[model samples]
Target: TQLDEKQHIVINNGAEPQSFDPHKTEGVPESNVAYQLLEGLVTSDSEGKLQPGAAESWENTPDFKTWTFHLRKDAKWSNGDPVTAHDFVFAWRRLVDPATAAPYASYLSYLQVENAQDIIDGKKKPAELGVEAKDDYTFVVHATNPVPYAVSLTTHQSLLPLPQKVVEKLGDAWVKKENYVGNGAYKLANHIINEKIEFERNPLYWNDKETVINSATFLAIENPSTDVARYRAGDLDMTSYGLPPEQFAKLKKELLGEVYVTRTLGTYSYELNNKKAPFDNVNIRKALNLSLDRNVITDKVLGQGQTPTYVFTPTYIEEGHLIQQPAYSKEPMAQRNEEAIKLLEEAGYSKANPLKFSILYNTNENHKKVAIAAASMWKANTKGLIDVKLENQEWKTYIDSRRAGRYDVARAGWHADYNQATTFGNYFLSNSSNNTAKYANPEYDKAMAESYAATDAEGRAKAYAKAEEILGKDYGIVPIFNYVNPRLVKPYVKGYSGKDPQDHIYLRNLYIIKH
Candidate 1:
């Protein structure tokens, strides 16, 4: 029996995306997908600059710390409920609520809004977030300081409005697929863990569905080889489980499809649990930093066309700028390595007793390859006495272990949620929910606060740069490489452009154009 063309875009399930609920989820991959199935108060253009999504437009206060959004009059949920400011208020409250344990709560810090953190920390009530629904069409926001990324934050899923009625009725259960109401272009039709997720276009979607593929099937294929194989077999239309350069080279000849490469604001790094034994020692952290040869790993494990990084930011960003060395410190890689070794020696490691520890990464082939290469390099640098234990787990499990503070050191990556240094700097702030390292430097933390407090873009960037220099010098995290978006799409698919690292594929913008 032949299937309709609608079913041909099927994505096979190799692994499951963690959660469809945007506010409470941690990983970017899941959030990326959620961005498609959900609607935000505002959206972004190709560069991730803010654009209107649910809100038709907005106004900013003279101080630039306040914004008032006017909802698109025609916006409605899938269940025919009106989309309103109250929904946004509720969603903002949920994100900051400590009970929700949202990982993205730090996105709101220094918003000049009162008690947002305290409310999220459960010290105050949710009613304290600076958003208020004035009427059905209007909402007002007050920031604690000037917030240039204000509109960008509105694009975050944590800020996506939730249906108050549904939440009130279903309480904790409201986020489930059946109970969820979306204002986006598609409705999640089916989800089977480790199997597949099917999204059907919503007929009532305010925008034009012709702009998107009629339907999309997402699969959790964990293996890059399998993703390639499935695409070759015509079982898949596209795949983002990127292959190594060698494998990609082979596929290029075999598949001969379009290859896209764009430098992204993401960094691949390993984090040391500052609360743990050796990592608690700054010298040990420095030793590990100096021991790994990032170039070797990049070439051998990650392949060429990728930049090897020694700092926290991506190559194009402030410190990682390709033309000049990062500010405040201009130490070359060789000098940095020498300093790392000296710090190791200072930390009590000798020729006989080297600093020892374990590192963990997701079990994907790419991660394993990088981890093994890094481990080997460290072992060699420490004269084979530095025992480097390597462990791997499923992606979700690995993240869970990190959150529970169970691992000594682990691999982590971040793509900019929006095009700002804070997208990266926010990771290390002591109070940030995303601060996995638990490394706190009051000076560094204060810099972040002051940056956000600045309503001016240049001032904010300068402040964040200061913080980056501090973290870069500490070598608290070893940034190995950054990514350019590399994906393989079939000729049948179109309109796949999206900005943020989440790489949201607004299916509404995708359509199959048959030759």
Candidate 2:
């Protein structure tokens, strides 16, 4: 570890990040780090609101059909080269290119970037994707459909510009600390695998004067309680991964002003492999989904501030709370349990012939506890009509296991890349790599596609509601609860904004008090 100095803030970034390449990494752990190193065409303020980044201004038509950006002339790569519009065009093409096979490749298509879907499907070349650099300082994009949240979407980490000169020469090696170059306020100084990441201030940065944090250290600690321990030991100024739920009440009473409970634009759900045998039956899927007691998990098991939810999207996001709820929410669990037994019996699964499946979660106590509680709920609600196998795997293996469709049901959750209903809804499309369930419904896809094309907010909301209704009726995934971000930050740590629904904290705004 580096010296425990005032300007050097050590943060627990939860798990070891998978990769620094924004195109390849798919989780919050990687994005948290990416936010510090890469400045997209747009960036986030402390409020999680969009702010200009590499691009200083945007010029768009009234219909918002064409998107254009004015690149910052002072923006420079860590190698002292000026950043231009070409860097963004090259990086965006790579994101949607079939060869890249990025997990989020479909995101471009969802944004309606011209020819993005064709490019992703190999019908068109990456070079033919809709972006162009009109001049060294100006970037332009053609949209096949008018995008309502187009400007807001530019702040996503996956949309960040890449140094084309470096990536072309070094390939994946360019992201390593030795060869890494970034346009953001920080530069990679040292990265010890699964241990720590040390980032030093960039003197050449345009905003260097305002970037007060001299050095930022991200300690990759997976355990929640371990974060609390490090936070108390005076080794860390802030913790990011999470705080232990068991210690929440105790710590809140003793640690005053350090613990926080805020809701986020994320959902916790169990994904079922619709392609698998037992789960292939819609009746069986409905029975299994209906059997879980969500309130017990949120209130009794975890004791965290998580709200039991019936819908996939959080209410805090734009009209996301207005999305349709399942019919069972109005009825008590007594009827829901009876309905579960009815479906199980209708599918020929009774107490004698039980429905069997497994829940796959990665190596974490919080996840394990949730899975255990869920398994117990299913067992009790079904009244011995179902058998659940609680399976735990390490993070890497767990990711592969879910993608390979090896598990019947698995623990899956998602945070918003950008704040909108489509941010979560579009991921359930038939072709989305993020859809762990491998769910493919023509009606659901049609509804989402319709939602994207609608220009009016009310029309769009109706389409989104229609899309969610289909998922609710089909029982595609079991929505358990809406996530509440729980973390511990020292009282003396200034400028850590707790109000952002995404819970993004920028080091540039932070300065430690002398006390």
Candidate 3:
């Protein structure tokens, strides 16, 4: 008996990718596909450790302000074009180009690359961005300050090298399956929107020798119950997004070794549109945050190892060292409700003049349930002084509404891009693309800036601490709970580890064992 060459794994990716173009992607589903189709300067191993990808090796200056990467000479795209340092230069330049409008462009600012910010701000030409190709195989990056996670940042899909010629030639059609050119473990075979995306292993990949999986398929099963049904029926090999809370216990008892639960460096919360009325008053925002019974939400609503939190940053980071205690974490729910009611009264929001706002959440059973629970809590605690109307939209629509400030409050979640507290704390920066809250406080921005410039780890951590304090005290966003990812993997799936929730699944690391 022999393993079939067509052996592949079907995974429930939850949603369709917004775009396959690296520069335009800002969501997990898009990133999951991008990681399989492209290789960056650095890539994460199974354990989430930084390892060589296109760049075989790299070096940096003593001050850590300048870095150089040496690309593999034999690396080639699926279309047979040689992968060069210039690909990275072009991709990075496109990322910060004002015309491109990449949502994660703020990541460039964190890189502190010379002129990158100016390019993004329309003050300089894209050519003036600090990244440059020294030769066909050498790429150099000049940073304005020391970036502790410089290498780790490279593992991000946004930093992946692109085929400049193909992009320039195809323009908006560059990501089409027929025109797509990738240099990763797999190449795009076909993509049926909202149905499935299929990939065939790339023979030209630099590490093709170790890339065992011959093919892969990702199904867009948005509903959790359907996803679980497919998994149990043997129609799917794995699920990227796990079963809902309602099905957790039953599945756990039935499927013994198939379920995998692990801690994730992610936060689940709701963003209050700071620019709008009601939330514009910090007192109102604080009252809303204090009124919620997180224990009830976590234990009764989520009920699957999720921990309640009033703080934005999770406790797993920094060995449990937090800058300040959460505003309502120490107080009992009854006492917190009392304070909340008082704040609501002071803010001119009572039963007569209720604080009315709509809470928008993406269409998912879990999200809907959570929103309903939260709304109930607010209404009860404030004695009907806070009236929250719930609205549900598909994932894409909800994202657009939130980004455009079309909602008063919106459900949002953040999974760390890298293993750092800044990954969570940087969201409130005045210029951050991810700042859906539209929060702007000069003091908070200064703390984040200082954190980026700090030379020592201790100094950097302290700066981040101050930033977190500002965000929490100002009620920039209401923290609901820290996330714990629950996943399902088939018994024979090898090398499928749930290590880092942020990084995408590496197809090269997976293989199916035949009985």
Candidate 4:
């Protein structure tokens, strides 16, 4: 790939985001673009280590129950408004407000912020939320329990500060390019739905001197093949998550070192709507899970060093550290299938009656391949006892339908928000807005609560282990495989290296090196 030092680097961001509002969108495509446009109290470095963003420094109480952050004096929004603690205060409150309908609002509870649960539960007003602006630049957060990952949590897009003045004045149109104001290295210059979103460098940014890239453009290319083709033709400097497995070999051979593949704390799974009929039966859920072979899917269908797994959480976060033992790690496929048949029969499904359900997946070539493969496996393995149907929808529609519990079994993927087991475990909590399955079990919730309250690392690990066991035993979700991110990066693209489990792209750090 040739480098044009002054030209804006283009990225093929897999799908068009449903909204540009940080609080309203949950998809990676949205977050990737948001990261460039907004800054939180803290941010992450290239290695996924915590670093300062808007906040110059922070500290916590001895008990870890309260945290205080001091905003940088020079930080300013694109509109020249001084960034202050009140911005964070308002953003956090708005996120937890039921009217905002932020899908990841339950993350406040995960942070154990005092009164966050009450505010979310409608027992208290959003004004009573634990976050407070002590002064213009001083923010304080009171946590109900010890939250060790509080600093890292601040880096999340959901926690990013918003321009309250702009939002209030412009109403819902505040995200429009004409009215948008952000406090990051870049500002929204233009957004054409399903085409591209262009970002211009922000001169008002606190660290504008370090902002090397003048502009970045995110092009919406839902199809993996098209994305790879664009990357090869130099139309895209990179492809987000749309790298096709079929092109892996050719890219590795031709591009060599330019092709990067790294382990990510993400899981690709199928979510069974626990509220729907048939799937409401635990046996039916287990039967569907055991019917498909993950080894085949990971090896044959998604052959870019992905790992087969029966657990939702990945085996490791950073290198050389094992998290916990997977629930069905030792079970062989033969035995798993036998047990699945017995469970199906016990649930009153047999060759005569047959179990019928549909698998809903987003319309992408990779997703389509996986859905077809899984559906075929169930039909063949169940010996006339299973009738599977396949349906595909665009990314936005698929996410909406899944959240509404409008599917029998839906394709889903979870990339950890932070490098912790609880990041994955907390999603199954009864009230988590991300709990698309609508699966609720008291034991599961209890275990998660215990895990959150556990002070010691060993205790927290044990509690989460128990939670994973309950999830697997009840077949809360069918874990297919762990993800390995493979992408094409131009040789001249500098500072593009990082391993955020949440898939956040720090565009500010990147620059084109021209010879």
Candidate 5:
């Protein structure tokens, strides 16, 4: 029989989050857990379709520039206060307020329309936003233009509501468990950073709680190599299987089918800081793209789990798009190297004059190995003309440096926020935090605008595909491999699941029952 019927999930992090408030939470690991403890106005299904949450339904104006949502009357905060439409309005306004320093400000511009660009440019106040709560149950969103992706983007955590009273009373401390309040299925019970999370089912939750797990302790164990020892010691019920090639081979000979992998939106890619020289030239970028054997990287570095992708967006979501077609597909590994050298020579690099750049990656064993492998491959292809300097930093510091445009070349990864293509594609937008390379194009922006104007899913997808192709052909960035979510479950445990690319794993539908 399972002991206490708790789904003991482990993660690797230092401490409990400083804030669970969506506006303040930055890291993906923390954000993934925080999202589960809070409810959003809209939710998404496994297929990435937008569904209702606190909001029962919504209808847009004929022009598709405005939308009005009807809230579920039963929604209530953990403290029993009503979860009203005004909470969203206040949250949205707060997100755009420059003083809030919310990195998610760009995500809300779909609601700002004519003033969106101006607001982002610091010329207008967030109060000029296009969203309002007409009364208590009703809310409306005004877009600067027709926005097809607005519905999809609304499913993001930034659109999740924060009770007004809670936000005001706690001020900066609202996201702390004792000071926190939300309308989700679970309430914050205990948070011990880098240790474990304990969540008790919410009694006031609107949906059925009978099967809902009463208490969950998500432990922190970022090191993949530690999983075997931790599992053997019986200290952890489940640890993600993220072993490197060598360790994985040993694990395979021993554990076999115990390691599970699922296709997801997580893409591991390296960005050439376009803000700097050498990488600034488009031809140089193209040459860099032509240099590597993506196939070998996929099979060797990622094992058989990942696919070689030239496009920034993964291929499964959309088909028959020009961007989805591999442009460098015909070039053999040797041929590609020759082309790279020729381009490098043209870009002012020779045997004596080498191009030196630092390749930055997370300290995680697997990620570091990927960086090392890439460095080796680049070195092998360039015949020592390209000197790859390897640098390692903690995840947070690496992310900060990338966003600040401090690196000449860096490796960063993304796990999707939702299942849509936009989740990955939008990150490269000139204003987005994920735009670590500082790469932007007027054509890409135009494609985004065209896609946002389309009301139908197919049309919107086509527009996005066009934009993505422009990014791919230009080699704005290089795709290493998409990820597979791997989990190791104890025999006695059941109903524990993993997140998809968008990190929208619904724990509400799962429970842990004693054997």
Candidate 6:
């Protein structure tokens, strides 16, 4: 297994990124590339272990409300400008600034950063955020409450340092390849919408000497089957989900050394637009959640080793797990159907006047099949009382549409930002930027607020359960199945681990082995 001289790889990133701006980008497509182009204060491994990134080291006070990070003096942006603590200070201020409209801005509020909520509420200015650059290389944070997982929050891309010089001078145009300046292992070489996004080694990166992967390309291939075709054809080294999940069993047996199935903390769910018609009715949302057959969809349709669930949080994170399954989760199909019909009737819909809504999903075999299965179950189980129309949009449009509250119900999946229950809890916050559902519940919000103020594990765990109870009771979202990381990484690709709960792939951690 000698090292390959080329040290290049191609990855099928699945979707076109919604935005290249670290604070604005939405999901898998954007994040996969962000991991290469931006370095946070700290980085997390496949095993959820924290390691140094832009910061060479960090320490926190005993109360855990204050943290100090020592940036690596050698770290430099692609433009050869020193990566300083001031860049992160600017990024944090910009993130929570109400005028910025950064989608994941609530992340700072979730972290309980001092003045974060007030800034996001427009009550304070960006300068008021409790983060400061003590010196060129020293960054510090002050949180309103104890944040025992300070480093964990630092791993998020929303906290990635930004080159204020470029961003301010170029404004929105700074993200374009030629104008982009990043302080990570790779820099943007090229980006072609719906074609591919290309990256090259950043010679000025802090650890450029040992950066094994000199170049990587993220292909915008929407079809999972094409990923397998391109991979088998030797045009791709890995895929996010190799083949369709239906092909998992055969692929694992045929490609024994390459197919990897690993544990990941993710949930595949559907977001109901709580502000829209049909779904706005709680009874309708409950009926939709109750009518779906999670067992069939996960076992027969997906076939991948995904676990069915009725709770938003995945099964692995056992801290605030639901003590009992929702009563509807245990009911037989017939019994569930009867209850769904009753609920739909209560919502003023019947077979003659069916409860109609669209299920929007991105163009992918897995998503299409799951959408079909869900639609069929809704109609059949409800005895035609529910009518669901299936629609497919490409990645960017789907993200925009859902965020604009344009759909009644849309397919959505979430991977843990950090290995915490609040990772899921924070999404339903009343002010959460990513809350496409527009779901506002004081009970749910209060429970989450209590969890952040918790001084002990017991208090935090109880608050988590309370929030889960409210979500289930409100039918906040239809939890489908917990995700398992299914990827096809060639045996020659070294340094990538299958153990990361978030299923993140870091180009800095990879090298090619000569076959």
The best candidate in terms of TM-score = 6
For residues 275-315, write the lDDT of model 4, one tens digit per residue: 88978888888888777889888899888988988878776
Compare candidates 4 and 5 on lDDT and give the better one: 4
Go through the candidates in order and give each one's C-alpha lDDT: 0.72, 0.83, 0.85, 0.84, 0.70, 0.85
Question: What is the Å distance of residue 248 in model 1 from its true position?
Answer: 2.1
TM-score for each candidate, following the candidate numbering:
0.91, 0.96, 0.97, 0.96, 0.88, 0.98
List the lowest-lDDT window of 10 residues for candidate 3: 318-327
lDDT score, candidate 4, position 62: 85
Cα distance off (Å), candidate 4, residue 71: 0.6
Which run of 10 residues does model 5 get worst, by summed lDDT? 7-16
Query: Tens digits of per-residue lDDT for model 1 on 337-374?
Result: 56666776777776688766778887667777788888
Q: What is the lDDT of residue 48 in candidate 4?
A: 76
Q: Could you give candidate 5's per-residue lDDT for residues 330-417 as a string of tens digits? A: 7677888888988888888876888788988756667777777887888779886677888887666676787677887788777766
Candidate 6 per-residue lDDT, tens place, 35-122, comes to 8988899986656578888888899999999999999887788898788988999999999988888888889998889999999999
Q: Candidate 2 on 1-515: residue-level lDDT in tens?
A: 33225587888887778788988877877877887887888777777877778888997888888998999887889899889999999999999987776877887887889999889888999999899999999999888888868987888778888889999999979998888888888888899988999989987777888887898899877778777888899998787745677788898899988887778888999998999988888998888777888888899877778888877877568857558677888788899999999989888887777888889987778888889888888888989898888888866678779878999999998888778888888888898867878898999999988877787888888888888889888888889998888888887777776777566667776777664
505: Cα error in model 1, Å:
1.6
Clashes of 4: 0
Candidate 3 global lDDT = 0.85
The TM-score of candidate 5 is 0.88
* Model 6 C-alpha lDDT versus the unseen true structure: 0.85
| Quality of model 4 by C-alpha lDDT | 0.84
Stretches off by above 4 angstroms in model 3 are 1-6, 318-320, 501-503
